[PDB]
Amino acid sequence: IPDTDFDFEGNLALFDKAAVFEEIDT
Amino acid sequence: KGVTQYYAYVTERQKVHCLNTLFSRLQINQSIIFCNSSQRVELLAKKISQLGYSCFYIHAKMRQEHRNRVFHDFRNGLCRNLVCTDLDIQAVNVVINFDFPKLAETYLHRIGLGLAINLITYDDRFNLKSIEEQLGTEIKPIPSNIDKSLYVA
């Protein structure tokens, strides 16, 4: 369990929310 | 509603690492932390306690007399964090959906001045999409610095 900060930013971009919502809508 | 709704993207294995960081960086008076099964409530509460933090938990697989006493202790400020499954306290300024809820109804029950942080895994994506549309409102990716005016009284 890293004594260091979780990288929110890096992990946020692993997941394109707009792209994903666009695809599911098709 | 004076709730600001963020999500972080995580896998399951990152959840604790993620929460611990939220535990450090947010200015918490009291928090409530939701998971999706009683087992996970117990495991997380233990995890939280091993990481060095105060922690009650309640779930459905308890006697009501016991659940109600813990909940009352928590209401009275006799702990900082409560891990629970689904059922406000004024001192609670942060709510964490450790496990993202499956229905908008259930989300509303968990979210209903505060912050609500959602932990979203690849498998939560249809629920996130469906829950957003159903409530109108968007849950914005968690920013690098959250404005203390939004959740600190």
- B interface test, pick of A3, A11, A20, A23 with most B CB neighbours within 10 Å: A11
Look up the domain containing B56 and give its range.
1-153
> How crowded is the C-beta side of B28, counted as CA atoms within 13 Å?
24
**PDB resolution in Å:** 2.3
Which residues of chain A does B119 touch, with a Cβ-Cβ cutoff of 8 Å? none
Nearest to B26 by CA among B72, B81, B89: B81
Structural element, H or E, at residue B111 = helix B104-111
**Strand ranges across the sheet with B56-58:** B56-58, B81-84, B30-34, B92-97, B114-120, B3-9, B140-141
Which residues of chain A does B25 touch, with a Cβ-Cβ cutoff of 8 Å? 5
**CATH at residue B24:** 3.40.50.300
> How crowded is the C-beta side of B38, counted as CA atoms within 13 Å?
7
Q: Which residue has the tokens 């060095």?
A: B52
Pair of tokens at residue B76: 């009275």
Pair of tokens at residue B144: 């690098």
Helix-strand-coil percent breakdown of chain A, rounded to 5?
60, 0, 40
Nearest to B44 by CA among B86, B84, B10: B84
> Which DSSP symbol is given to B78?
S
Q: Could you tell me if B25 and B52 are in contact, meaning their C-beta atoms sit under 8 angstroms apart? A: no
Q: Could you tell me if B51 and B65 are in contact, meaning their C-beta atoms sit under 8 angstroms apart? A: no
> What's the gap in Å between the CA of A11 and the closest CA on chain B?
6
The count of domains in chain B is 1
Nearest to A6 by CA among B9, B148, B34, B83: B9
